[PDB]
Amino acid sequence: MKLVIEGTIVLKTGMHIGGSSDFSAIGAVDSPVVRDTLTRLPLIPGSSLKGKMRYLLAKELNNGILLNEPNNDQDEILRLFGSSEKDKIRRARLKFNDIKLSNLAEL
RNA sequence: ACGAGAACGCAGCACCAGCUGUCCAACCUGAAGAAGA
């Protein structure tokens, strides 16, 4: 079946997880954070979180050394995050999603 | 008894690495705790 892992990410320090420099020239910085395109809310891409988490887990499950390709690291890592190896296509068990800023009203 | 039937343009990938919001600059100048008769 399918399990949904809920949670909250709280920024202890200011986070610059962005790479989008699109739309308005109303006075934006040359290095803006990635935002939701419709709601203009700051956004955490699921790819950023997935990549950072996979990197840290693969280093920790090795342990401490991560020099291999992403498709060669560990069986646990491959089954959690997916492997596109030509013969052994291991499918990701985790489906990360883009995360929007939730507590805008509190801010 | 439809040039048709069946067929996910899909799988893995951190917008990331390095970088002091720093340098120079007196809170300063003048002034009787003093005078009737």
Side-chain angles (χ1 to χ4, degrees), chain A residues 25-54:
Chain A
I26 209 160
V29 67
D30 59 354
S31 81
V33 289
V34 58
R35 298 193 191 261
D36 201 61
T37 301
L38 188 78
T39 44
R40 272 92 172 172
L41 274 169
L43 188 150
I44 289 181
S47 59
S48 290
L49 175 67
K50 185 197 183 181
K52 196 58 150 164
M53 183 177 176
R54 176 187 199 143

Side-chain angles (χ1 to χ4, degrees), chain A residues 35-64 66-85:
Chain A
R35 298 193 191 261
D36 201 61
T37 301
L38 188 78
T39 44
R40 272 92 172 172
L41 274 169
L43 188 150
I44 289 181
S47 59
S48 290
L49 175 67
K50 185 197 183 181
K52 196 58 150 164
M53 183 177 176
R54 176 187 199 143
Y55 169 70
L56 297 192
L57 259 175
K59 184 182 300 316
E60 193 68 344
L61 295 188
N62 216 9
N63 52 0
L66 191 54
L67 294 174
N68 52 58
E69 292 295 326
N71 276 344
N72 279 95
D73 45 4
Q74 277 280 115
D75 179 21
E76 289 79 350
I77 305 296
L78 294 179
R79 71 204 202 194
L80 265 187
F81 300 92
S83 163
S84 74
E85 198 163 342

Side-chain angles (χ1 to χ4, degrees), chain A residues 2-3 46 50 80-81 91-98:
Chain A
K2 182 62 65 68
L3 312 180
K50 185 197 183 181
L80 265 187
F81 300 92
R91 173 162 172 254
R93 259 164 205 183
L94 290 178
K95 192 269 182 182
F96 292 78
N97 302 293
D98 284 12

